[PDB]
């Protein structure tokens, strides 16, 4: 199976460096040409460049220039994409992907991506805080309640309500990263008005890398 | 660069249907040097077509691609539930290759308005020093939407970030949560906290809101 297998998700502060690598296998004849393209979160895909293993020549975006550097171990079937003087707007996924033949080429082929989080955080569990209403009108069919899973790092973290037993109407968001360095999500559910003081709601969040696990009953 | 241009930005549609998605470049690119990808959430990217009308290896022929000079287009004959994705153009005429900003093909249904909630913050939050106002807009369609925050009626800018979650699979809807982030001393200067809601399922936009001091 053909594939290429990118290194794993990387932290940095703002002003350092990132190095991704990409290793290639299972390929009948090695790609000439390997490329680099990212995407921030919710945007859209930004070509960085390429590189041509055999020779080791890479080729740029110029608003990329000077920043990133793309190289090629044509021994280990390797390519790696570093990118320097980090900032805010370079946390994103890095793909790389193989091409149809050529330099400026469509990409056939595609890594996993590595997602790359430039942030000045330490690792961090998350704040649990209820989110129930203060009033609701007796014109509403439905009620919602959840909770704000707030200040944690790194991604990511697993919210089940009701221990997982409830599933139906539960929507949880993807985080954002806040101005600070830390991620802040919310999951609600919503219910009928009916059962909102006759049930019990309670979420499970679950932050391994800090070995963080929060019951918290939200109630008014 | 050459800018690509996609259209429409979000498009509409029911499986079955016929889907025309359009990409303009800001210059000619020939007959060839144009891809479209396909792009679900948390996957890479997929090639769909390459030298403009190219299918893929094992692409179905229900996908294809025609254009030239500055006008393409890519046609799905007969849409499949699994074809509700983001795509997006690529041009590879010059250096830097640059993609389109992408079209949301999402699943048509009729209009359905938010149901809106609002949350103030816990005391436990209050405690640490720092007040998170939530609010919840569930359910709608389509897409489009707009938060705005007030506190005492000053139309808040700058500290408020949002997040939507993916169409849902089963009823097609939207949903989306807003965070209104102020210090707790800014929190203790004001009364009334409110989200004011615009949507087509709206015949005027919707306000929740609450006073600090009764919650």
């Known amino acids: 199976q053909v594939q290429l297998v990118q290194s794993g998700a990387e932290v940095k502060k703002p002003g350092s460096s990132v190095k991704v690598s990409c290793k290639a296998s299972g390929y009948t004849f090695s790609s000439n040409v390997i490329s680099w393209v990212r995407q921030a979160p919710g945007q859209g895909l930004e070509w960085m460049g390429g590189v041509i293993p055999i020779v080791d020549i890479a080729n740029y975006a110029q608003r990329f220039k000077g920043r990133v550097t793309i190289t090629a171990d044509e021994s280990t079937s390797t390519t790696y994409m570093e990118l320097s003087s980090l900032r805010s707007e370079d946390t994103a996924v890095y793909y790389c992907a193989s091409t149809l033949g050529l330099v400026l080429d469509a990409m056939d082929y595609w890594g996993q991506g590595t997602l790359v989080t430039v942030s000045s955080a330490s690792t961090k569990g998350p704040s649990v805080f209820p989110l129930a209403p203060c009033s609701r009108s007796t014109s509403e069919s439905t009620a919602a309640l959840g909770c704000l899973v707030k200040d944690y790092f790194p991604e990511p973290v697993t919210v089940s309500w009701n221990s997982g037993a409830l599933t139906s109407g539960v929507h949880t968001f993807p985080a954002v990263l806040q101005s600070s360095g830390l991620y802040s999500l919310s999951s609600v559910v919503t219910v009928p008005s009916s059962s909102l003081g006759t049930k019990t709601y309670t979420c499970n969040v679950d932050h391994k890398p800090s070995n963080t696990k929060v019951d918290k009953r939200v109630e008014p | 660069e050459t800018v690509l241009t996609q259209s429409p930005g979000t498009l509409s549609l029911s499986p079955g249907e016929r889907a025309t998605l359009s990409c303009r470049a800001s210059?000619?690119?020939?007959?060839?040097?144009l891809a479209w990808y396909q792009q679900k959430p948390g996957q890479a990217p997929r090639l769909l077509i390459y030298g403009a009308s190219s299918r893929a290896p094992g692409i179905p022929d229900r996908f294809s691609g025609s254009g030239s000079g500055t006008d393409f287009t890519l046609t799905i004959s007969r849409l499949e539930p699994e074809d509700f994705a983001v795509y997006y153009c690529?041009?590879?005429?010059?250096?830097?290759?640059?993609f389109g900003q992408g079209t949301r093909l999402e699943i048509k249904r009729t209009v359905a308005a938010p149901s809106v909630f609002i949350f103030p913050p816990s005391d436990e939050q209050l405690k640490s020093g720092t007040a998170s106002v939530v609010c919840l807009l569930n359910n709608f369609y389509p897409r489009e939407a707009k938060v705005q925050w007030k506190v005492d009626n000053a139309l808040q800018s700058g500290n408020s970030q949002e997040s939507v979650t993916e169409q849902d699979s089963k009823d097609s809807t939207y949903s989306l949560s807003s965070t209104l982030t102020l210090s707790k001393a800014d929190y203790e200067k004001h009364k009334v906290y409110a989200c004011e809601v615009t949507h087509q399922g709206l015949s005027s936009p919707v306000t929740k809101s609450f006073n600090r001091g009764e919650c």
């Open positions: 210059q000619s690119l020939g007959s060839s040097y």
């Open positions: 690529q041009q590879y005429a010059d250096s830097p290759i640059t």
